[PDB]
Amino acid sequence: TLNGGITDMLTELANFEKNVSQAIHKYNAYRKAASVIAKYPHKIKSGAEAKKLPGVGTKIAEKIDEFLATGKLRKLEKIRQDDTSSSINFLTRVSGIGPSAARKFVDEGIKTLEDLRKNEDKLNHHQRIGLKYFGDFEKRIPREEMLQMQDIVLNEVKKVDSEYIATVCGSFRRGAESSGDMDVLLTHPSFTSESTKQPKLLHQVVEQLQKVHFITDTLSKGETKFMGVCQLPSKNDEKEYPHRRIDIRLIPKDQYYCGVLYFTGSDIFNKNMRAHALEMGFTINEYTIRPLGVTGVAGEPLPVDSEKDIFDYIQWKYREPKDRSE
DNA sequence: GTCGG
DNA sequence: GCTGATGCGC
DNA sequence: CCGACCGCGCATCAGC
Ligand SMILES: Nc1nc2c(ncn2[C@H]2C[C@H](O)[C@@H](COP(=O)(O)OP(=O)(O)OP(=O)(O)O)O2)c(=O)[nH]1
Ligand SMILES: [Cl-]
Ligand SMILES: [Cl-]
Ligand SMILES: [Mg+2]
Ligand code: NA
Ligand code: NA
Ligand code: NA
């Protein structure tokens, strides 16, 4: 946690622009800056020194100068005093409440945690489960718990059919010692970019995991993306574990390396990598990397047979998952 | 809010 | 219903 | 200056 004071200021600035200002590029600006400063391996002693790194420009320069002087930023201090923005920031912490839902609720007087309980009638389903497990969803997961969760998922999956492969990605695959949640990549060989030979492929998995009582709730569920809740099982009169967020993404088996790249992340790394593809003249998503025509239209999928092939198309040296934390 | 063209 | 735009979350 | 800023799944709503 080297430059943590500066980086928390920028993350607090980014959350403001995102939740209150509804200014998604200001959000990404502060996020990039916070990311570049967090990877920089000295103690920033001046706003100008930070201005050297890309994505730290003039206005973040003044803000670093001030933070280094006072230990505060008064733009922030006053954002924290404003009760409209502080109520908006808080409501967005409920999964399913975004910036728009937050401001609407505040316009209706629903401002606090007890307000939300009074009015579970005015919530959609995702918002309800987000409120239900509001505290749990804010706890991290130690890696050790991730390892037991991995074992259940990989052993339950093997039972539905032995040809399912299931890869835990996200921060776990990047080597984190604690995780915000669990992210699971799922391949079955009967689902490729050329056919879906069997339906319910993802539904069977969600079904099996529900019946061992691992999956406990559902936020959203289509035929390739599940978004819900799980909980490790406890011993005899041991305290229950917190409930955990789990996403499971069924990707066509022949598109595994683009899928595993996407789900390993991080979100910022993905953004920077996909942006660099575009300046090199490629477009990357979770399925394919394609060349861009002389006009804008994306071409046809380039053949990929490892993660490193994707890095090589855009002329980056490969980076291990644990070096993709940005 | 930053940056590259 | 279907299509598309938006919110929200990755 | 000034526009472009990753890309997409699912839930939901408007409009036909
Ligand atoms: N292309 C893209 N991918 C994203 C974005 N957000 C998340 N992802 C991908 C990369 C993440 O590593 C992965 C899982 O999303 P998470 O929110 O769980 O992030 P991650 O697991 O890295 O962090 P965590 O420790 O769980 O909070 O999904 C995004 O805005 N764009
Ligand atoms: Cl691939
Ligand atoms: Cl594609
Ligand atoms: Mg995660
Ligand atoms: Na800079
Ligand atoms: Na939210
Ligand atoms: Na996730």
Coordinates of C-alpha atoms and ligand atoms in Angstrom, one line a residue, chain A residues 251-260 286-289 302-306 310, ligand 2:
Chain A
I251 CA -17.9 -19.1 -23.1
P252 CA -17.6 -21.1 -26.3
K253 CA -14.9 -23.7 -25.9
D254 CA -13.0 -22.6 -29.0
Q255 CA -12.9 -19.0 -27.6
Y256 CA -11.5 -20.0 -24.2
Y257 CA -8.3 -18.0 -24.4
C258 CA -10.1 -14.7 -25.1
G259 CA -12.6 -15.6 -22.4
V260 CA -10.0 -16.4 -19.8
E286 CA -14.2 -11.9 -24.5
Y287 CA -14.6 -14.1 -27.6
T288 CA -12.2 -13.0 -30.3
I289 CA -9.6 -10.5 -31.4
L302 CA -7.7 -14.0 -35.8
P303 CA -6.7 -17.6 -34.8
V304 CA -5.7 -17.8 -31.1
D305 CA -4.3 -20.8 -29.4
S306 CA -3.0 -19.3 -26.1
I310 CA -3.4 -12.3 -28.0
Ligands
CL2 CL -9.7 -17.9 -28.4

